[PDB]
């Protein structure tokens, strides 16, 4: 010690950090970044649930990010700012369990109320790095602790062989759960209050946060909850045991390998190797599909989250849910024939009935019938214009929309308190077509408060609507409602209830209140369609 | 004797009888029989020409209404009781009857035939609402309407048999457009500009008519209101006709031969106090004895043969009402009456579901249930009403009426579409009802200028409105009047921009897409269920 900054040092349960004082534009903040809260899960410890970081000798340096864990890198677009932007941003390791902290400069006197952020990326990708997820201005503007995991992803988070002692799978969300447990016992020594830790995620962070309320021993870790744009309950947040086990297995032989010999070949092999071949385990050509996700396996999974979301109770559990206007505008770049960010993507009805047949892969010529006849506008079945914005709708409505209606309906019935939101505001800064509309994803950067950074070239109308997002996300975190006490002029934002059915807008305009979700779309996709494919 | 009054055909003389209209006298020639009696022997057989008569027939009063079943629901209300015979019912129901100008048109003047409905089991030409003495007396019309042999004894059919061979009812419509062939012209009627019109089981066979090649020589021009031949109701197959005939003969006491000889013994009430006892199930909307598919008058299906057929030359004018499945449900599903409101349940609506489609599986009811349910609110018992209302309708009507404009449009033919949206003033039943099936017809025939009637000055306008709508597609075949402007104007039905108009109060409405969407989930995907399954 001795010259050095006496407000960047603080211990926590493995030893000494000697944090950072990053600038904000409008002060400065303390961050602590790549505090390991786990034993690095390389070698033998690969598929292995986590262990608990060995406390270290002497003072950790907590100035830069972690590695990034293992994961596969968009190639699609190369240079192109929309799809760099989640790229990862450090070293890629196996060795990648480190979480961030941020928080006032100084840290605060009181006990503070604690925003713990899971990042998305279908559980194949993400890192807690990336500049989206800088907790820097929530820290200074509302005052704020916010902590970011880093958790395993595709074959090493969420490769599973069920029943097995050397891969019992649904490890990546024990990442998480360790660092959940990390922030009851440590976050004291920051100013963070442990009795009010909100949990929030986008995508599959949003996922995982709803797999952490259905899981009884993450219960205790925190106290409310939001979940941007992903549920727990759907088509590609989960799998079976059978249909992990076969990935698995089949994983084994496109890289050369009794499930014991079988991980063991597994652990010889390179990283690289088994993300190389991961998108090749998919039943079929899918998108919206992720090989290596989360098992119901009868352990951190009881059930299926359908099961567990209609059984449970949440009398007392505070949610904030959500959904951007264009949910699948993005995935259909990515596989379907005919879509591109470089031109208008007008397509034919041929390319979108063969869109259908891959935004949804598990449905029967019958059932596939069934959506294009839905979606079609039989005023102008051929219109291309009408078929991409619906093919859009298509993949938005059955992976994201139509499951959390489906969540926010049986929370909000089963005792918990709901609100819900969709995000409607197109970011001026975003580099994707107008076509795409508001995609998936593009919310984070306004919830985070990026508009604020003044180099980043937003307007003065977008700065205001970051800082009004802030204060529904911390006032939720605190009283786990989005509205301020104080204001009470501005409108208000009710409770998502089964009898009404509200929620509401975010866009540079004030709140505005509208009722049903996509109410006669989700009974289709919710009620029949499930009944349909029974035969 | 009014040399007006007198008119010589085929068969022999006519007295008319000069009527009274609020604008003028009309010739009327009411009771002019077209066919031979199909009475004894000639029960469930196809009608003959009537043979030559002596002396002057008197043409002055309605004949009998062929043998039916009458309802009994709510006797004394004028509403049901409108379409209740206002004659005697007999077997001898083959006569015609005949509204032409007075005097007569000194110019070949386009005919109108009437063929009336009430789901093949009843009806008749003597309805006051089938009054064609207005568009006679105001548009200068030749207006004809025919009586036909209904339920049993137009319909009954044992498929293959000389004696029970089907569509009877359907032939008895012919005759009477080949009769109209034949003597239209001492009337002063065009026989080259024949145009017919009907409603319900009427359109139904307007547009078997259209399907059937021997009557293709008989008219020029259709008009569907409310009906088709394509359908869940309108036809059966050889082998369901079959079965209902083989099983009313059980249920009456009676090989071919001598089934329908034992059915010729048998009083007509006998027949029709057990005309509904085989229907397959529990139904609405859905009718014993209709047209059935023979491979003769109908080669194939309707749907086989309007996906196939040539229509270049036809001129057709489509349209429904706004509720044409309200007066359904007071006959059947729990819950409804015309007496309170029928604010029902969500099982009593998933009941009816499973009525007003007897022919779903459990999978395809749930799928009606689930389209039509208003998940903002899918207890309000009020638009859960509305729903089954709308189920009924549209099944049976609605869609079907757009199924076929749409195969016209697209094989040929040049089609116009409306609905009808005014409900009468002098309406009785409920409100929630709103413009029920059938409620189109008092406007086209004109009765609100009867002033006994008690409509409204602009129901009296409206009407007027439709009557030469009407009768200017008989003349053109194009509603239009050449005389008009900026209205707009009413444009054909497409399959591209499948545009129709709305009939009320208001100015013509020009609207696309004929509930293209609901219609989309009846036409194309509920058979793909149940054809699969
Ligand atoms: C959470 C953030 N997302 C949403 C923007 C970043 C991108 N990744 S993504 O999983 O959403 C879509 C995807 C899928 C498969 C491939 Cl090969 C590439 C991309
Ligand atoms: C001119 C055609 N309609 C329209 C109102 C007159 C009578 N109504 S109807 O016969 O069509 C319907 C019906 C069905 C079954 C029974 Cl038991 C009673 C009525
Ligand atoms: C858009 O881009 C994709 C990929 O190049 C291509 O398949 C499609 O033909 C393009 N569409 C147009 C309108 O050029
Ligand atoms: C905005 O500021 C200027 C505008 O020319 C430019 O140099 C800078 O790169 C822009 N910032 C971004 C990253 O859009
Ligand atoms: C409507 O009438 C039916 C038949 O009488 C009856 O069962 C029902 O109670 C009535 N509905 C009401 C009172 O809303």
């Keep these: 010690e001795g010259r050095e900054d006496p407000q960047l040092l603080?211990?926590?349960?493995?030893?000494?950090?000697?944090?950072?004082?990053?600038?904000?534009?409008?002060?400065?903040?303390?961050?602590?970044?790549?505090?390991?809260?786990?034993?690095?899960?390389?070698?033998?410890?690969?598929?292995?649930?986590?262990?608990?970081?060995?406390p270290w000798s002497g003072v950790l340096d907590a100035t830069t990010f972690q590695?990034?864990?293992?994961?596969?890198?968009?190639?699609?677009?190369?240079?192109?700012?929309?799809?760099?932007?989640?790229?990862?941003?450090?070293?890629?390791?196996?060795?990648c369990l480190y979480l961030n902290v941020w928080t006032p400069?100084?840290?605060?006197?009181?006990?503070?109320?604690?925003?713990?952020?899971?990042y998305g990326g279908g559980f194949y990708s993400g890192?807690?790095?990336?500049?989206?997820?800088?907790?820097?201005?929530?820290?200074?503007?509302?005052?704020?602790?916010?902590?970011?995991?880093?958790?395993?992803?595709?074959?090493?988070?969420?490769?599973?062989?069920?029943?097995?002692?050397?891969?019992?799978?649904?490890?990546?969300?024990?990442?998480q759960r360790?660092?959940?447990?990390?922030?009851?016992?440590?976050?004291?020594?920051?100013?963070?209050?442990?009795?009010?830790?909100?949990?929030?995620?986008?995508?599959?962070?949003?996922?995982?946060?709803?797999?952490?309320?259905?899981?009884?021993?993450?219960?205790?870790?925190?106290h409310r909850a939001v979940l941007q744009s992903g549920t727990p309950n759907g088509p590609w947040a989960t799998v079976s045991?059978?249909?992990?086990?076969?990935?698995?297995?089949?994983?084994?032989?496109?890289v050369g390998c009794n499930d014991t010999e079988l991980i063991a070949c597994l652990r010889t092999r390179?990283?690289?190797?088994?993300?190389?071949?991961?998108?090749?385990?998919?039943?079929?050509?899918?998108?919206?599909?992720?090989?290596?996700?989360?098992?119901?396996?009868?352990?951190?999974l009881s059930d299926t989250p359908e099961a567990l979301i209609n059984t449970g109770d949440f009398q007392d559990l505070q949610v904030l849910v959500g959904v951007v206007k264009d949910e699948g505008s993005y995935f259909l770049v990515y596989g379907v024939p005919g879509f591109s960010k470089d031109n208008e993507s007008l397509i034919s009805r041929a390319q979108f009935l063969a869109g259908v047949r891959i935004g949804v892969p598990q449905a029967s010529d019958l059932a596939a019938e069934a959506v294009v006849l839905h979606y079609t506008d039989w005023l102008h079945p051929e219109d291309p214009t009408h078929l991409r914005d619906a093919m859009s709708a298509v993949v938005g409505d059955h992976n994201v929309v139509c499951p959390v209606a489906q969540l926010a309906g049986r929370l909000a019935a089963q005792g918990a308190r709901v609100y819900a939101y969709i995000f409607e505001h197109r970011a001026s800064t975003l580099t994707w077509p107008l076509w795409?509309?508001?995609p998936h994803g593009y919310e984070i950067e306004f919830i985070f408060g990026l508009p604020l950074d003044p180099s980043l070239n937003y307007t003065t109308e977008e700065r205001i609507f970051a800082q009004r997002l802030m204060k529904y996300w911390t006032n939720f975190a605190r009283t786990g409602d989005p509205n301020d006490p104080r204001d009470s002029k501005s409108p208000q934002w009710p409770p998502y209830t089964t009898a009404a059915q509200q929620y509401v807008s975010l866009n540079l305009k004030p709140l505005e209140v509208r009722r049903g979700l996509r109410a006669q779309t989700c009974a289709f996709w919710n009620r029949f369609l499930p009944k349909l494919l029974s035969a």
């Design 270 to 300: 390179p990283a690289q190797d088994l993300v190389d071949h991961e998108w090749h385990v998919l039943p079929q050509e899918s998108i919206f599909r992720f090989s290596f996700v989360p098992v119901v396996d009868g352990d951190f």
């Design 241 to 254: 045991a059978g249909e992990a086990r076969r990935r698995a297995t089949l994983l084994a032989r496109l």
């Design 436 to 438: 795409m509309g508001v």
């Design 127 to 175: 890192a807690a790095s990336l500049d989206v997820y800088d907790g820097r201005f929530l820290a200074q503007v509302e005052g704020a602790v916010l902590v970011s995991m880093n958790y395993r992803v595709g074959t090493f988070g969420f490769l599973a062989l069920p029943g097995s002692r050397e891969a019992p799978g649904n490890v990546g969300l024990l990442d």
């Design 105 to 118: 400069y100084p840290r605060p006197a009181s006990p503070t109320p604690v925003l713990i952020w899971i």
């Design 10 to 54: 603080v211990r926590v349960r493995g030893g000494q950090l000697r944090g950072i004082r990053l600038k904000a534009p409008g002060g400065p903040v303390s961050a602590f970044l790549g505090i390991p809260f786990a034993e690095p899960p390389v070698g033998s410890r690969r598929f292995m649930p986590p262990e608990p970081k060995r």
């Design 67 to 95: 590695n990034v864990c293992y994961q596969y890198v968009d190639t699609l677009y190369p240079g192109f700012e929309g799809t760099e932007m989640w790229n990862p941003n450090r070293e890629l390791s196996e060795d």
């Design 178 to 222: 360790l660092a959940l447990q990390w922030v009851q016992e440590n976050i004291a020594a920051f100013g963070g209050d442990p009795m009010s830790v909100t949990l929030f995620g986008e995508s599959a962070g949003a996922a995982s946060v709803g797999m952490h309320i259905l899981s009884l021993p993450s219960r205790s870790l925190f």
